[PDB]
Structures are given as C-alpha cells and as structure tokens.
Design a protein around this ligand. Structure first.
Ligand code: GIF
Length: 757
C-alpha cells in the first residue's frame, strides 16, 4: 500500500551503455546488447587522472504495477554525475547539470499501468568540469515513491529543537502536505517520535487545510522530558514517523531521522550543548579509492571510523554536497559537519565548472542542499563556497557571497553560514568575509593574529590546513613519491606542527580542517595530501595527528629499520605521553621529553614540540621505543625490526563477519612478511587473489599514487609492504567466503569471511 511505504529502492535491473548512440531514449529502442547492472554505479573507476567525461546511457524497463494505478509516482535520484537528461516513455521529464545535488521526476502522467515502461537517463559529463575525481554515472541511490493524492512531497518535514536542556527539549516540526485531489481538504497529522529501541515515546498531533492542487505548511511542537542528547561521545538518534490522515483514512507515512542538540557561536568560539567545542577536522572528497564514487555505506563507515581513531571530531565536505548516507553516518557516529555547496560561483576555475550553471541553478541547488540536509544533527554550518575567485573582485564580489548567505538565513537560520577563504587579506578587506556568519581561512596560520587585530568581531576557524604531502612508508635519506618525514608540499603548504603551533597561540580559532584525512583520486593519478592512504592504510602523518588529538596513551616510531650500515637514520617518535626513550638492541639512546627536546624541521626552520627525535647510526636488529608519563610509568611501547627477504603473505580482514546484502564489504589487509613474520617495509610483490563461496572479489588497492594498476582486477602489487583486498557479499547468500592470496615465491595465505542474514 502507498499509505505505509516511504520510498523504496529503484536501483535494481538497469541497462548501461558507455558512449553516444542515437534514439536510446525511445520506448522501442533495442537495449538487449547493453550491459546489465544494479545502481549505484561509477563507470569511470573501471576503464584503464582517470578519464571521467563523455556520454553514458542508462535504461530501465518495468511493468506499471497494478498498485500504482491512480497513485502519484516519482523517481528520486540522489546523484547523477553529471549533465543529466531523463525521459519516461520517450517524453523528456528532467534535466539536471550539477552532479552533487539530487533531483526528482514526476512520472504520474506518462505511467502505463499493466504495460511496459522505459525510464532513460543520459549523462553527458564534460572534460575540465572538476579539479578532483568526480566519478561518472548514476553514482548515488535511486528511489521509487508511490503516494496517494494527499501526501508529503520531497524534503517535506523540517525538524528543529529550539530548546535543549537536560530536563527538557522542545522538538518543533514543520509539515508540508500536497493535495493532488480535485477537492479542498483538512488533513490530520500524527507525529510519532521513536527512540533507539523502536518504542514510540511521544506523539504530537497537528493539522493543515490545503486547497485542491495546492501545497500547505503547518508548525507544531512537543516537549521531550529527560531527552537523550545527541553529542560526540553519545550520538543518540531519534526517528520521527509522520502519518497523514484524510478523516479516518491514512494517506501517507513519512520518516525523518533527527537528533537533539543545541549549537551556538560567538566571535570567541563554537558551542555544542553549552560547551566549547574545537574542530579536530578533516576535509574529505567523496570517492572511496578502489571502490570509486558509487555510494557504499560500509566504505564510508570505515573511512569515518579510521578518522575517529585519529581523533577527528569534524568533517568539511570539500567541495560539494555529500551523499545522504555519508551524513547519516556522521549523525550516527557523532561527527559535526560543514556541508559545502560549491567550488566556484560566477568566475571559472575550470572551463566547464559550476559557473556555467550559477545564474540559472545556484539558488535551486543551494535550496535543494539545505532542504535535503537541514534535519541532520551532524551538520553545523552551511559553507557557501571554497576559494572562490570573487574574493579578488574588490567592488562586487561580496554581493555574490551575500546572495548565498541570505538563502542560508532564509531557509535554515538554525545553522550558521560559512566560506573557505584562500586569498588574504582580499575577502577580509573587500567586505566578503563579513557576509557569512563564520569566516574560514585556508592556509593562513601566519596571519591568524593579524586578522583578529584588523577584524576583531569575525568568528574564525581554519577551513583548510597543512596540505603536507607524503607517500606511505617512503623515506628519502638524506622522486615520484614524497618523504613520509612530513616536510614537503605545494607553495602554500606547511607541516601539521605549524598549524598546531598557531592554533595554540590563537584560542579564538575554533579549529582546523586538514587537507586531507584520506587520499583521494585526482582530475600520478591520485593524491599525497591524505593522512591515511587511498586504501585506508595510515601513513606516519596519522600518528602525528593522533598524538595531538587523542588522550589514550600511544607512541609511534618512524622510519622502518631496513637501512645500510654507515647511514645515520633520523628517528622520529610521535606520542601523547610526557616523554619517550629509544632502545637499539637493548641499549638506551636517551630520554626525550615532549615540549623540551624539540625537533628541528625544514619549512627557515621550525623548532617543533610535536615530534621527538634521535640521530641513530644504523646497526641492524630491533629498535624499541618506550613512552612514559611524568612519574616514569610505562604507558605504551612499540618495536620495529630489520626484516629479511620476503617469504610469506598474511591476510587480516577488518571484519570476519559481514551482511548478506550484496553491498557490505570486508577490507582484508595484505602484508608481505619475512620468515619470522616481520613486515618487509619496501616490498612490492605482485599478489594474486581468488575468492570462492558466499561472495566475490570486489576491488584491490595499495595507496600508491603513481601506478596504473586496475582497482578491479583480482591482482595487486604491495606498496611499502602492504596492499588491500576488498571482498563483497552476494545478496541473500549466507555461508563461508573463502579467500586465497598467492604470490610467486611466497607462502600462500588463506582466510574465511562469514556472511550472515
Ligand atoms: O593543496 C590543494 C588544495 C587547495 N585548496 C582546495 C583543495 O581542493 C585543493 O586543491
């Protein structure tokens, strides 16, 4: 029934064709040769940065179900990258250029009940339309919505919490109802607020009069006593079930996930639930490396989990709306989010960027973003742009900023607007920074003090920071890869130590958002900016951040200990403990106290309190680091060993049990070890993979930016000792999935993944 169903998946059973072909929108077109696949789908991750432009066609053929007779029928696309045209039974019903905002088509008038129907989508992504890897295809989920003629249209519930206290929160709810009948009506609304255990704990009644053919809105509120407060440690989520009634008859059911938290900002900082919050933040691009751009919940969850292990409490969605699923995870995992709309406005950064669409589409797209995301408790700011060229239009650039900021204020005043500024002092002197609620600075720690003198009333944070580059496990002593000593970057870049320093000296700054948390795909086809590599393996940079951003005692040592006798090895230790002591084959090499024994790093040079360092003449064997508190008590330790020749493969699944849904993944780390089980720190052995039983091979990676190996062939070379196998369940198939990893001259490895549900 249409009254109980709130939008089901329309992802299954499509036809795809990469390339231009005449008349493929037509009912009678013959797509029998076309490849068969389920959405979501990124075609650009398959081919051989990686080519992302051209033409792609999708067609789905379906019977008009008898239950859809006299119903309103819509197809929702969360994302199609990019330049979409859509047809139903040959009639054009949709056209959407921007690939990061979703859109909806109404197929009610053209739907044929009991006969065949053909939904056709053409994507024409252009070259030079993105500064990073966008993907190509219907890369986000697609939804079928079958409603009765009185119903809640898309983004039709808006949930706010204008009072949030320990004793009582007030939940305010705006309901939008569409009356597609030929009669005026008064309709009842029942809001059921449902807790984490599935029990309805409060019901709020409302109603609305809507004339025939029209849409109406109504507002009501309800008290929640002793509420479960959404916070970073305890990210408690409620579920709102909204039911529409026409007299005794239910006409529609509509669900909204929401949380209960208050946010507040002054010129001196940001506040969550009445407490100062600081952003230990990361920028992330939307791809998931070997998995490409197609939405995958587990891929995103893993990425966010790894970021939380680093001490990350905040995300900047550089530089576009993310998927809804990504934001659902942030909600569930207690991360605060800066939800960013655009990378350029009226002035072009790239030839076929958003400036082509800005005048016609900017209001519609920003409106669509805020309407889509204004119920996520994770979202705390609307970022209207990143590094936009209008920063240097002295006379008029501020007007475009105001225009976008006013739309933020009109649609959702419960969250501040912001923007990421890379020019200095331009947008501060040109009246631009003042048009948003909170100003973000990109790569300007040296100017933090000065901008506060000149513009003391602006709230501030580092919207983009560091841009330090490294390759995982690569050290250049004394290139095509970059040193993992974390010194090098582009002209505006600087090591993390510099941001930490200037964050401490400028407490008003709300925090930072590093470029980037994970490596991402480009247009060397991928990045080096990530603290974690493209397949989810932490670089040494991860531990530098972890040492600064977490309390749980840790210690990490670099580099590896496969060197030549005679070399002097600079040895760096990152810890959150008071001091550390280095031991080479049992012999002490000295204590070093953090904040006292400083490490000089080249930028001219900086004395950093954030690294501990030794100069060690290389004798082979084992190098052990011990971290202590200020009483001398051992709190953590790590040991690294000079490894021998590659002898064996070890396989480490992140999860030995996965869901039998056809989408869920196990990420199996692949190690190249010597005879004693020590990792071979520079190994590049080709590993081959075989997957049998309940599931299949999905993808491989190694975090190497400068390779052309496929992400989707069952073979991959190690990089700096490791690579990564990704397997996936088959839908509704339980049991064992058996993996075998082989490599010429090494001991074969096996592991089993169990698949349930
Ligand atoms: O260091 C490179 C970064 C500069 N800021 C904008 C990002 O998208 C990226 O290009």
């Amino acid at each position: 029934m249409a009254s109980v169903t709130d939008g089901i998946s329309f992802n299954e059973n499509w036809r795809f064709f990469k390339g231009e072909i005449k008349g493929a929108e037509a009912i009678s077109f013959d797509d029998d040769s076309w490849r068969k696949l389920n959405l979501p789908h990124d075609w650009a991750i398959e081919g051989p940065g990686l080519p992302f432009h051209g033409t792609g066609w999708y067609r789905k053929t379906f019977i008009g179900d008898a239950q859809w007779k006299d119903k309103i029928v819509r197809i929702g696309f969360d994302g199609a990258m990019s330049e979409a045209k859509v047809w139903i039974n040959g009639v054009k019903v949709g056209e959407h250029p921007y690939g990061y905002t979703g859109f909806e088509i109404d197929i009610t008038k053209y739907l044929k009940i009991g006969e065949e129907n053909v939904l056709a989508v053409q994507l024409t992504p252009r070259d030079l339309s993105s500064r990073w890897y966008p993907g190509a295809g219907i890369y986000r989920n697609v939804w079928l919505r079958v409603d009765n003629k009185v119903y809640i249209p898309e983004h039709g519930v808006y949930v706010t919490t204008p009072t949030v206290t320990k004793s009582k929160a007030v939940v305010q709810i705006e309901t939008t109802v569409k009356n597609a009948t030929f009669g005026n009506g008064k309709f009842n609304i029942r809001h059921s607020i449902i807790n984490a255990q599935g029990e309805t704990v409060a019901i709020l009644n409302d109603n609305v009069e809507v004339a025939a053919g029209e849409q109406g809105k109504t507002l009501a509120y309800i008290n929640m006593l002793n509420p479960n407060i959404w916070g970073q440690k305890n990210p408690y989520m409620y579920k709102l079930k909204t039911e529409i009634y026409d007299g005794k008859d239910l006409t529609d059911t509509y669900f909204t996930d929401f949380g209960i938290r208050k946010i507040c900002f002054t010129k001196d900082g940001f506040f969550l639930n009445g407490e100062k919050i600081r952003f230990n933040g990361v920028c992330l691009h939307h791809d998931n490396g070997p998995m490409g751009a197609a939405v995958n919940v587990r891929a995103d969850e893993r990425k966010l989990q790894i970021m939380k292990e680093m001490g990350v409490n905040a995300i900047r969605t550089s530089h576009n709306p993310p998927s809804p699923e990504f934001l659902d995870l942030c909600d569930r995992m207690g991360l605060v989010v800066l939800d960013e709309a655009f990378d350029e406005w009226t002035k072009a950064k790239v030839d076929n960027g958003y400036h082509l669409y800005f005048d016609e589409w900017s209001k519609k797209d920003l409106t669509s973003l805020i309407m889509r995301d204004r119920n996520h408790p994770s979202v705390i700011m609307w970022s209207i742009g990143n590094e936009i060229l209008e920063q240097s239009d002295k006379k008029k650039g501020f007007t475009v900023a105001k225009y976008l900021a006013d739309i933020c204020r009109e649609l959702d005043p419960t969250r501040p607007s912001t923007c990421g500024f890379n020019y200095y002092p331009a947008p501060f002197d040109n009246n631009m920074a003042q048009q948003v609620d909170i100003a973000g600075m990109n790569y300007k720690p040296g100017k933090y003090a000065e901008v506060q003198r000149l513009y003391p009333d602006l709230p501030l944070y580092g919207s983009e920071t560091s841009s330090c580059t490294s390759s995982r496990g690569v050290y250049h002593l004394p290139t095509n890869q970059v040193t993992s000593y974390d010194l090098i970057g582009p002209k505006w870049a600087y090591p993390p130590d510099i941001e930490f320093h200037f964050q401490e000296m400028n407490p008003r700054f709300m925090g930072e958002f590093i470029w980037t948390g994970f490596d991402y795909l480009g247009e060397s086809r991928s990045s080096y900016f990530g603290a974690v590599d493209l397949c989810g393996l932490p670089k040494d940079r991860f531990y530098l951040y972890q040492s600064q951003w977490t309390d749980k005692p840790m210690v990490h040592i670099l580099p590896h200990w496969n060197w030549k006798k005679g070399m002097n090895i600079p040895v760096y230790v990152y810890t959150n403990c008071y001091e550390a002591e280095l031991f080479l084959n049992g012999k002490s090499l000295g204590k070093r106290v953090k904040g006292r024994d400083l490490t000089e790093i080249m930028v001219n040079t900086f004395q950093s309190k954030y690294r501990l360092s030794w100069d060690v003449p290389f004798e082979p064997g084992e190098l052990t680091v011990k971290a202590y508190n200020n009483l001398g008590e051992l709190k953590a330790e790590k040991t690294i060993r000079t490894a021998g020749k590659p002898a064996q493969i070890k396989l480490i699944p992140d999860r030995k049990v996965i869901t039998a849904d056809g989408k869920d993944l196990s990420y199996i780390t692949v190690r190249i070890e010597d005879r004693d089980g020590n990792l071979c720190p520079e190994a590049d052995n080709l590993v081959e993979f075989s997957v049998e039983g309940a599931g299949h091979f999905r993808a491989v990676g190694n975090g190497n930016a400068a390779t052309t190996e496929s992400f989707i062939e069952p073979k991959r070379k190690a990089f700096s000792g490791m690579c990564m196998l990704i397997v996936q369940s088959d839908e509704n198939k339980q049991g064992k999935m058996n993996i075998t990893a082989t490599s010429k001259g090494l001991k074969t490895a096996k592991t089993t993944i169990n698949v349930e549900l």
